[PDB]
Write a protein that binds this ligand. Structure first.
Ligand SMILES: Nc1ncnc2c1ncn2[C@@H]1O[C@H](COP(=O)(O)OP(=O)(O)OP(=O)(O)O)[C@@H](O)[C@H]1O
Ligand SMILES: Nc1ncnc2c1ncn2[C@@H]1O[C@H](COP(=O)(O)OP(=O)(O)OP(=O)(O)O)[C@@H](O)[C@H]1O
Ligand SMILES: Cc1cn([C@H]2C[C@H](O)[C@@H](COP(=O)(O)OP(=O)(O)OP(=O)(O)O)O2)c(=O)[nH]c1=O
Ligand SMILES: [Mg+2]
Ligand SMILES: [Mg+2]
Ligand SMILES: [Mn+2]
Ligand SMILES: [Mn+2]
Ligand SMILES: [Mn+2]
Ligand SMILES: [Mn+2]
Lengths: 683, 289, 289, 683
């Protein structure tokens, strides 16, 4: 066993009844003085390194050609001047195993952390040396972390796409289904997770040109997509991951759910395609009143009204659907469907739950389209227009397929540096650059939506780490007050940066004029309610930083009205799974699953303590499963009120609790304004 | 928690030798070299001899000492398969491929063979050492039984599976595959009965039983390596057979609820080709907060 | 001269209770009086007990002491039938016709019934008295087994046959007829093995063995009379059943090579009415025409 | 039990030791007296019937509008003047259960046999009343039978395409694979059987964008295609049928074959995807000499030579591939592979066998392309060019995808009418019309090849029926003499009609000038070998008909040289599954499987004796399984020497014969010039 492995395992060997957390630090030293420094490839100077990486097809030469070598040297020197040290063994291990650039045979390390950060910063700046240094300082301080696709692939010749998630709308036609399968394979080839809205597809037993009971429903398309994602599995490196979203009022909703039952037959079971359910407020109202609900056949509704079932408001059209004899429907028990959802989530963690009305009551771009589904991580909530892929030799009507670039603020590092504004603006600029340089030649709706919406996702990580390292319980009202203030600041500065980009470029996102940003409605709660901290401890935490007031929000509203906004969507809180290790941060705004996690790598086992875990903050690092899910819902709703897109909200459940407890948590989330629920992980 | 399920799986796997016609094997048998025919005969006799011990002693002795009517019935069914089905099947294969005098000579040779005898007598020794109302001695015998069912047979099964995966001796290979499928479930079932005893023991007694199991595995494994070279060097297969032994040793350990002993290895592709949370209704007022 | 043909007959008679759907008896069962249902449940429970011990103990122990792999294979197969097929079939019948509480009660009733305990004590005692290499103790146990197969089951068999013959409970009756068909051949086979041992003795020893067999039969008979009255008086059939058990006692004696002991009587005529493709390698001459 | 069913089951009841065959005739009468006439919709006049069928969207207005009502009435009167009577119950039952037009509620019969024949004739003639009457006389004499798609769908508004055999070339790209899946779905939606060539696809473990061990091979593509064919199942009417062809020198050939093994796992086995193997002469030579063969990685060959492995002649390329270090290959035993093919055919009848050199040594259009694969029925053998389907908003390079037009001559009816020439020419004209009226808007290469090649398949059926009713054993040399003469006349008149159509329209098929028809090579064996019958009995059979001599063939060769040929391909012998029942004929040129076949429809049993079966010809109606497969191969080769495309050739084996016998039959078929082997049906 390696020396650093033994040093890391020495953490759990208690001394005087206490964990040896400091041993972890020793491990990193070993991991660098025995493995990383020996396995790294050193050159005489930076010129030889850059030339070797360029000619050997490791780096794209275009982004490096925008800078003179003196500027690149200055950027690299700025990166190395911080003398960044990984405080935990797992941070360095995760970076050098998942994100550091290696040779073709993967026998040596070509990229250090500073090298990777410098390359990403130079790609972000697009020829601006000062901007590149700003990005270097932002990432080496670990205030901002680009998503895994962006951080791993920026400036690389053998790179994939920098966009993490893609959302596709599938129209009710064989041509559209085949095009959706093709685009899903193309985007999984690019490495991104693909989500498909199957609510427009007509249910099982519908007519294909006057011959009835002919359609296979959404389950056949689900099987096709599952095989497509199995085939396109990132060249066999990462399993192809897809998501299917169906409205709960679709007739196939049961069969949909039956794809995830552990007793499902092979002709129905789907195993590589995640499932999500979109629940309008009408379904929750029907379940609450115990009135029997009706699921609908989409094609009959489309024939009668000319629009898809998910294209209009069910809260106002459900009674018209039920009373219409030309609309076909089936009777269901909404409470039984809710119990089935809870049982499925207990068994397998599926489906994702999207509260459609919670998303669309604060959605700023309802004029473009209502949000009808979410992404594979159930945090992207954007307007999408379905595409009409016609026959060959016929022009296709290209719609809008959602796609946003992810980037997370490290809350602990951002607040320690007292740089919410600067970090938010620089992250917005980096995400705007990632969107601008993204061009996908096989997904036309994705390309058009990227060019028009200009949507980005700016997330946050290390919420629980910051709260526990500052002596604040994650479930406490003080923690929710901190989240309210911090994310109001993040939203304020993201809107300010979006408006500044719109002013400097003279262009807004497409159809911005009909948005609530243009009409000023979006700023209502910000121009009437003060989001400054209500607790003295939180206010002290925010000292040295100008917390925006109602007057600052009014000025920002006027600025947006004058100049517009460059981005249709700005903030989305992704799960941030593996890149949180490198940043020494807790995953996303979720509470920690465990204080010390035991992970098996190779034939060895390693223990990763939570960042900053110690004796004095052991009980502030409360495990998520031990927490009240209602207070976690309260925290997520408090954050969500300042996030325009959704938050990947994983439910952390105990084995003792029943499906009724899961249903109660889901209904409280819906009541509190939670937009989406990601996972039901049971301990 | 498991006996009725195993009952079902056992009885639905019932088969008889007569179902597979053997004569068509002579069309590939005639094309094998002397070393191939010799190895096959010796392997077959090895399997036959070990399986007879399991039918006459191994299964009936375990059925005798295990408490529970349903367990005794499943164990009786397994003993029946050894004596009435497997033994007749091995005899049928032999009578098809070799003349009477050749069969008698091969059995004389394998009966005197040092490596076959070592393992056969080690297993039989543990069956003979079971004492009435002593669950420790029963457990040790169950470990021996699992090692036979899930591990010791496989140095032998390798060769018929190797031919079967190549399109040679397909009728006898089909028979061997059915036998092997029975031994697999026998090993899993007896393994669960052993774990039941193991779980009733103290921590010190458990550690002692683990040491027993690993020590026994080591003795059998070292003899298997010698057995393997003795039979398979003449046909150049010993390296791959050794990988197959270790892979099956790991399965036997897992049947006994123990960790794998050997690192994971890939197996010869020709041989491979041959081979709820509590539902609680919503009570209303759960929609109001 | 006989084992091979018994082997073939036993394996060709193989069956499982699940082959017979039992829901068809639901109505004719519902229609029986409480007395009739009580006697029926108890009768089958008494049969279940006998098969439990014949499968767990009797057949395996006789298999252990009888020499020859083929004889052992037949006896092992018969043992499996007793506990894996016969004893289990009764539970299939119980689970169809009766609620769990009635099932629980009847199994409690077997434990406390003095005639059923006495007959089990006597039969199992003889099985457990067998001494290795002692042919006389083995003979005594084989006599006990023949008496169980060919005599003792029949106080139980009477009632399902009596109903079958009237067109009542015919699915359960089909199961019972299959069980009876098996026991008839089991009794003959064990009888032939017993005769082998008897025929080795001096005339003086033979005279003692006949005394043993007749004394044992009379002792079992007297107990069976009391058992029969206890079960059948409430349904009015005790005298009829008694005639049936005497008839079958004579068959048991005959299976042992002895003369009939009871005089012939008319049995209820209702009960009498109740009775891949083959693969060759390619030659170089197959490529030319 | 209905009266006609009792009269049909009375056949098996033997009177005086003989089957009551004549009782079948009575059954037909009952089937018409009790059922057909009662459930047949009758109109006061044909005008009312046509108006009702057109208005209720049963027929098409376009093809009926080309004639005056007087001409349509005259065509219908010509059809009804024959007073055609079905000779067997199964003929009428199959027509009125499969082909007769029924109401939307499927309880009444709108079309009789004469009505359907008249409608198909009017569709064929395209406005010519005399041509329509000629077609009516052709089909009511039952001399020619349009295929099931053409016969069922001609003139019907609610219909699929008239072509049901489609051959697709799949290029080695994700875009091409997705396009192939889409086209397969679209063609299965049209009701056609789709065959895909997977030899150009790179094997498992190949590089994608210079990353190693990334390709899933052709098995993942087969899984995708199998899912696509399961999804597209004719609106839930018939099981989606597809075929995949792989060259035997493709490395995936074993895994390909492993998709049909019973022991294959769920992630390996494809259930609704037929498989065929293309066997070049090089593989047969390697197996014959027992030399170990090599299966090649297609992408390495493409990188080294710039052409696909299946696009070059393996006979001259195999040694260069083996000796090339940059071509990756795996060692195999060709005899073991042949034994595996025989074993798989014994178990499941798969794969289809295509002898590439047997096809291409007589292929007339090798300049366009060599025949690389066959159809789902393994009788279509045409040149195909792969298409380069690029990314979106990029022009695709459309190639040639085979789609031939099926139609079968009834040999008994054709020869008893002494009308080989007239029937062949009229069938060629009808096939040309159906090919010209086919327009598929979702298969670009299929449409392009239909427009360019103008390939049709004119088959024959009732060969064994005709031979048995004329006292000729199917295995006799006289039967082969008759087949030789009859199919040489069929080829002669098909070529003459193609040249006449080319002269009339002034156009040939695309790239005809490079064909062997243009160079006169095709006619070589016809201008030197006389194909007149060598037996007096066969000559008397051909009495009253002019048999083309060598001088006639020389004149035809000169005519083709002067005027060209309209069709790239003319003749292909399809299995003719259900149309053989309606025509009261034996299926294809295959020998009969059973003298009397027992079928179960609903809960009723029915008995179909072979047409013309009696006590006198009971011995001549020998069952196919009892026949010597070598003599069946000889007859099929005799026919194949006059057929430009292939013949659906099913092997009929007994359970006693082993895989050595199957391999011997396959090798004798290869030796005798058999192009394709369809199925290995074991009795
Ligand atoms: N935790 C760590 N994170 C990142 N790099 C590390 C870490 N530990 C060691 N290294 C690398 O290994 C080298 C070993 O030097 P070390 O940290 O022991 O101190 P040093 O030799 O006094 O110099 P310095 O600390 O100034 O780099 C470091 O210079 C650095 O490049
Ligand atoms: N074998 C058959 N094949 C086809 N149609 C038949 C057959 N038998 C009867 N029919 C149908 O039933 C009708 C009645 O025929 P039948 O044998 O009674 O005498 P017919 O002289 O042909 O009658 P019609 O006056 O109808 O022409 C036929 O006209 C035809 O429509
Ligand atoms: C072709 C086909 C379609 N479908 C379903 C899936 C599609 O969502 C739906 C629409 O198919 P379409 O491609 O729209 O079929 P269509 O346009 O010819 O019919 P229509 O005019 O009614 O739109 O039909 C199947 O389930 N199986 C099939 O094989
Ligand atoms: Mg449509
Ligand atoms: Mg490519
Ligand atoms: Mn065995
Ligand atoms: Mn066993
Ligand atoms: Mn019994
Ligand atoms: Mn018995």
């Amino acid at each position: 066993v390696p020396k650093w492995i033994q040093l890391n395992n020495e953490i759990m060997i208690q001394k005087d009844g206490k964990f040896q957390f400091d041993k972890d630090k020793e491990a990193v030293h070993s991991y660098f003085v025995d493995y990383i420094n020996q396995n790294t490839v050193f050159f005489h100077n930076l010129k030889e390194k850059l030339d070797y990486l360029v000619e050997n097809q490791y780096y794209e030469e275009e982004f490096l050609s925008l800078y003179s070598f003196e500027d690149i040297k200055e950027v690299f020197k700025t990166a190395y001047a911080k003398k960044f040290r990984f405080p935990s063994f797992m941070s360095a291990f995760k970076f050098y195993n998942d994100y550091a650039l290696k040779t073709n045979d993967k026998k040596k390390i070509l990229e250090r952390y500073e090298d990777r950060i410098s390359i990403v910063a130079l790609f972000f700046a697009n020829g601006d040396t000062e901007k590149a240094k700003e990005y270097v300082n932002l990432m080496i301080n670990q205030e901002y972390q680009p998503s895994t696709p962006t951080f791993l692939n920026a400036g690389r010749k053998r790179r994939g796409e920098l966009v993490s998630c893609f959302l596709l709308e599938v129209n009710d036609s064989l041509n559209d289904i085949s095009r959706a399968i093709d685009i899903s394979m193309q985007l999984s080839k690019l490495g991104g997770g693909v989500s498909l809205n199957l609510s427009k597809l007509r249910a099982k037993g519908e007519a294909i040109k006057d011959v009835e009971n002919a359609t296979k429903g959404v389950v056949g398309v689900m099987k096709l997509l599952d095989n497509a994602f199995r085939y396109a599995d990132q060249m066999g490196q990462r399993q192809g991951s897809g998501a299917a979203y169906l409205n709960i009022f679709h007739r196939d909703i049961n069969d949909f759910l039956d794809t995830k039952k552990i007793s499902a037959d092979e002709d129905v079971r789907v195993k590589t395609l995640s499932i999500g359910v979109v629940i309008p407020d009408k379904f929750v109202e029907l379940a609450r009143e115990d009135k029997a609900a009706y699921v609908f056949y989409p094609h009959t509704i489309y024939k009668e009204y000319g629009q898809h079932m998910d294209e209009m408001d069910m809260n106002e059209m459900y009674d018209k659907f039920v009373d219409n004899p030309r609309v076909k429907k089936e009777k269901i028990n909404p409470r039984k469907l809710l119990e089935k959802l809870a049982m499925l989530r207990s068994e397998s963690g599926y489906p994702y739950i999207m509260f459609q009305d919670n998303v669309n009551k604060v959605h700023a771009n309802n004029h473009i389209s209502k949000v009808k589904f979410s992404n594979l991580c159930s945090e992207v909530l954007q307007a999408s227009q379905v595409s009409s892929y016609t026959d060959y030799d016929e022009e296709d009507e290209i719609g809008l397929d959602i796609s946003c670039n992810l980037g997370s603020l490290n809350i602990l590092n951002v607040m320690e540096h007292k740089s919410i504004e600067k970090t938010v603006k620089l992250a917005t600029d980096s995400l705007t650059h990632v969107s601008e340089t993204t061009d996908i030649r096989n997904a036309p709706a994705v390309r058009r939506a990227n060019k028009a919406m200009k949507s980005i996702g700016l997330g946050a990580m290390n919420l629980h780490g910051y709260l526990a390292q500052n002596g604040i319980a994650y479930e406490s009202p003080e923690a929710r007050d901190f989240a309210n203030t911090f994310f109001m600041m993040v939203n304020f500065y993201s809107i300010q940066r979006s408006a500044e980009i719109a002013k400097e470029k003279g262009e807004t996102f497409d159809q911005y004029e009909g948005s609530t940003y243009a009409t000023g409605e979006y700023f209502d709660k910000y121009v009437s309610t003060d989001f400054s901290p209500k607790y003295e401890k939180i206010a002290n935490l925010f000292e040295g930083m100008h917390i925006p007031t109602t007057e600052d929000w009014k000025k920002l509203k006027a600025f947006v009205a004058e100049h517009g906004m460059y981005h249709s969507y700005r903030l989305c809180i992704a799960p941030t799974g593996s890149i949180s290790y490198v940043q020494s941060s807790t995953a996303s705004v979720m509470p920690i699953m465990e204080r010390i996690e035991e992970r098996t790598y190779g034939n060895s086992k390693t223990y990763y303590p939570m960042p900053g875990l110690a004796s004095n903050n052991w009980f502030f690092y409360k495990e998520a499963y031990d927490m009240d899910m209602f207070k976690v819902v309260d925290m997520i709703a408090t954050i969500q009120q300042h996030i325009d897109q959704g938050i990947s909200f994983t439910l952390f459940l105990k084995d003792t609790m029943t499906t009724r407890d899961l249903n109660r948590i889901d209904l409280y989330a819906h009541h509190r304004g939670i937009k989406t629920i990601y996972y039901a992980r049971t301990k | 928690d498991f006996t009725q399920m195993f009952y079902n799986q056992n009885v639905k796997q019932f088969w008889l030798p007569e179902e597979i016609a053997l004569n068509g094997d002579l069309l590939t048998w005639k094309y094998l070299g002397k070393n191939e025919q010799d190895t096959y005969m010796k392997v077959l006799a090895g399997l036959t001899l070990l399986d007879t011990e399991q039918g006459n002693t191994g299964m009936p002795i375990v059925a005798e000492h295990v408490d529970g009517h349903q367990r005794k019935a499943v164990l009786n069914f397994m003993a029946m398969m050894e004596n009435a089905v497997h033994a007749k099947s091995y005899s049928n294969i032999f009578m098809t491929l070799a003349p009477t005098e050749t069969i008698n000579e091969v059995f004389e040779w394998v009966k005197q063979n040092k490596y076959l005898q070592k393992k056969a007598q080690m297993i039989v020794g543990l069956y003979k050492a079971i004492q009435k109302d002593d669950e420790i001695s029963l457990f040790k015998a169950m470990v021996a039984s699992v090692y036979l069912e899930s591990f010791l047979f496989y140095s032998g099964f390798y060769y018929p599976l190797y031919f079967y995966g190549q399109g040679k001796l397909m009728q006898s290979g089909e028979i061997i595959n059915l036998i092997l499928r029975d031994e697999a479930i026998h090993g899993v079932y007896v393994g669960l009965l052993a774990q039941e005893i193991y779980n009733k023991q103290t921590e010190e007694k458990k550690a002692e039983l683990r040491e027993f199991a690993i020590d026994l595995l080591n003795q059998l494994y070292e003899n298997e390596l010698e057995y393997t070279e003795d039979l398979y060097d003449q046909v150049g297969l010993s390296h791959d057979v050794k990988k197959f032994i270790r892979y099956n040793a790991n399965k036997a350990l897992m049947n006994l609820g123990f960790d794998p002993y050997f690192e994971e290895e890939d197996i010869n592709p020709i041989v491979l080709n041959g081979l709820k949370a509590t539902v609680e209704p919503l009570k209303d007022d759960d929609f109001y907060f």
